[PDB]
């Protein structure tokens, strides 16, 4: 309960099980107790009283990015920058209808972990299937190393 | 109508009249015709697609001394990428549809927005500005002119 | 409907939500049938066919004074003394305070309720936000105490 | 230019000349330079650039109250209290007592000096006349004493 490693996707949809299958591998290792490797599947995660509790989160999923199957892409969401942008938007939206909806937005983001990292895998196929392609199965192991090296555990 | 200079605030709430009172100064001045200074008071700008750059003058709650100005830049494209990241995260409270509707509604804003805000001395109901924010009006005109490049 | 408790302010503006939030707490209590706890927000209230029905009126709002963030100021507006003061102003023949305006002013306030009570909360933050600070959140229950105390309940 | 003693009324209307006639008495005594005894008549006085430059004001006029001609009546307008009542009204969000006009009204009241005293005289007659009744003439001398006592000059 300090770092969250979240695998996101449908294990019944072929290479969309990439994220969860990286969680299966991480569960087999001896990570420190502050790491929670969690398969959230397609059910999503509640920010209040769950995601709030982590200092740091790494999200793993499958992405429609151009390139070959199994290619990994690492990116960051700078959450502090996002709060500031929303605040600027608010100041222009103070007297419009959807200001409220914007502040509901901000309240959830304001408590997101200060470090948010996303690791995406290009699938080979997303059709119904219990199995990974070979490329995405190889990518699960490459993604462990990315996760371990983002945590300083390599 | 290429550039919008928008004064925002309630002229009856003392130093919240900062923005409109910056518009009053600029409105009298012999500015280029493509610039449209507008006191939108408390109406909220709604129209807005017609401009290419927007400069925003409001009063804002910051910690420093009264009459202090904050210039900041909102880069709407950067907000776009951040929204796509949030989509991938499947937060229960940040639902996919609202996220996309949010992205749609800001996509029509100009590419670059400037926000000049003013630390007020008092927002108590009043027709007048405090002395600081009074002085900060002219200070803020120079920011507008330099942001517009004219001075 | 013969006593009004009006919460005034913008729920969207952090601690400006003080008043409405106090009405929220009172709305979920077992108040007598005559009390009307109304969330006025930022719309104001018409005096004719609305404010005149109440012989007693309590207002809750956020007001920036010299004091600790979250403190309640309770003040009283005596419509009658204001009338007598307006008569003194008439006698003075101030250029900027013309007689016909003083008279219209007297007539407009004359239909207000006899006693009017105002509970202001010193806020901590008014930047756009759906929440109250801890101080103002605690002040809302404090204000609930003062409202029932001023009602006799 | 510190204390204003203001006589208010119409010298051509009999005992409505009480106030200006008290000013006549004061102007012929030897009063400190800081006292302005001013015959306002029926012309009124401007607050900005005039009344606001005094710290203490005494108004003299004619008032119909219960009581015999020449009876005097001293009252106080508590102006700082009156500001507060206007703020309380401004906080109230009454549709029929708007905010801008209320703020204009408060702009005047906000600069009146905190020390405001009113001395009224019950007339005998307000019929057209250059002269005061016996009673109100005698009341001018009594009002002079009230003025001098109020100022510490008795």
TrEMBL record, chains A, D:
It comes from the Archaea. This is Hydrogenase 2 maturation peptidase. It comes from Thaumarchaeota archaeon SCGC AB-539-E09. The lineage of its organism: Archaea, Nitrososphaerota.
């Amino acid at each position: 309960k300090r770092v969250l490693v979240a695998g996101v996707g449908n294990r019944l949809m072929g290479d969309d099980g990439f994220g969860p299958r990286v969680v299966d591998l991480l569960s087999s290792m001896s990570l420190p107790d502050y790491v929670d490797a969690r398969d959230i599947g397609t059910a999503g995660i509640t920010v209040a009283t769950d995601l709030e509790d982590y200092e740091k989160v790494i999200f793993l999923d499958s992405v429609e990015l151009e390139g070959p199957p199994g290619r990994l892409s690492k990116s960051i969401l700078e959450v502090r920058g996002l709060d500031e942008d929303i605040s600027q938007l608010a100041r222009m939206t103070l007297h419009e209808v959807g200001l409220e909806g914007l502040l509901k937005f901000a309240k959830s983001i304001g408590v997101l972990p200060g470090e948010v990292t996303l690791i995406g895998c290009i699938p080979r196929s997303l059709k119904p299937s219990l199995e990974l392609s070979e490329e995405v199965e190889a990518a699960t192991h490459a993604a462990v190393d990315l996760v371990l090296e983002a945590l300083g555990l390599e």
